Scaffold this active site. Structure first.
Site, PDB file in Angstrom:
ATOM      1  N   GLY A 106      16.918   0.479  15.100  1.00 42.87           N
ATOM      2  CA  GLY A 106      16.104   0.575  16.296  1.00 42.87           C
ATOM      3  C   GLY A 106      15.586  -0.753  16.832  1.00 42.87           C
ATOM      4  CG  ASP A 107      11.752  -1.626  17.001  1.00 41.70           C
ATOM      5  OD1 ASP A 107      10.686  -1.157  16.541  1.00 41.70           O
ATOM      6  OD2 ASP A 107      12.190  -1.350  18.140  1.00 41.70           O
TER       7      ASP A 107
END
Ligand code: CA
Ligand code: CA
Lengths: 152, 152
Positions: free
Chosen positions: B18-19
């Site tokens: 995700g990040d």
DNA sequence: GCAAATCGTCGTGAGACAATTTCG
DNA sequence: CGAAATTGTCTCACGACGATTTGC
């Protein structure tokens, strides 16, 4: 009431803390007894070229859908009962949004009693205030204070 | 070589997808044998008010560090050996960046041979292009191409 | 009257590098 | 010479709502 695999939940928990978002909103709408709708949404945003990952979630989670909005897409789950079932099993592995998750569950668990008394409704709207607080809220308008403007 | 817990790896793989970001760069530098250095980097970015999470990764990974860059911070890990150990274990759980992960692993393993031949090294820079393409690259300048421009 | 959907937008919070330096 | 650091920043890829409609 589908049961989810632990490892799946572990990974998803992480992906959600990253790109996910647990959202509680107070929606003004005259057709509702207290002029507002309580709306709980679990979502996952991703570049549309990677929409496949989101589509797979639909099959994996078993409910919800994917919506399109240009260069990005969203996995969306607004259904209260399945949402309660999903977050119940995800909640123990989250780390950045575990509280908004537990807050949404508490909101659902209370929905009924809330449609009864204007006060239970306001107190619940105080739960939605906390969720927005926890998230990086920046374009919020309808809070519990605006609901307080029901006094009539 | 630290032995990470599968559950921590499962959740982190999700957070990374995700990040996170798996980065391979070619830095022009006249101090290197072939006028360019090969830099591999594993990173997790996060709003600085949420840095405790990155500081948390430092202690759990047992290597790397966190840097601030305004309202945003980054857990950074570029040490070749720790990176290999770390990525070898996280990779089987990655879903979005598994390919870049394995590319780095392979890049790391061809390092010494890439040091004794402008061709091996050339080939390896071609590994880096792939990682960039796999990523949402938008400001890249030095590629294997601009490096073949050594053959003069 | 309420659950759930439809369709959009604000303002970032990320991802993904580049340019240069440090030092064993 | 080269592994790793230090500092900067472009371009989004997100997060996180809001307005209104559909449907039983
Ligand atoms: Ca995030
Ligand atoms: Ca992402």
């Amino acid at each position: 009431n589908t049961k989810y695999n632990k490892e799946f939940l572990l990974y998803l928990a992480g992906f959600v803390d990253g790109d996910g978002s647990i959202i509680a909103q107070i929606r003004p709408n005259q057709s509702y007894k207290f002029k507002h709708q309580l709306s709980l949404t679990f979502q996952v945003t991703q570049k549309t070229q990677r929409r496949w990952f989101l589509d797979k979630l639909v099959d994996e989670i078993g409910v919800g859908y994917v919506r399109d909005r240009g260069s990005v897409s969203d996995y969306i789950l607004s259904e209260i009962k399945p949402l309660h079932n999903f977050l119940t099993q995800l909640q123990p592995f989250l780390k950045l949004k575990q509280k908004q998750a537990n807050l949404v569950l508490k909101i659902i668990e209370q929905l009924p009693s809330a449609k009864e008394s204007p006060d239970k409704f306001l107190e619940v709207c105080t739960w939605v205030d906390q969720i927005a607080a926890l998230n990086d809220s920046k374009t919020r308008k309808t809070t519990s204070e605006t609901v307080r403007a029901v006094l009539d």
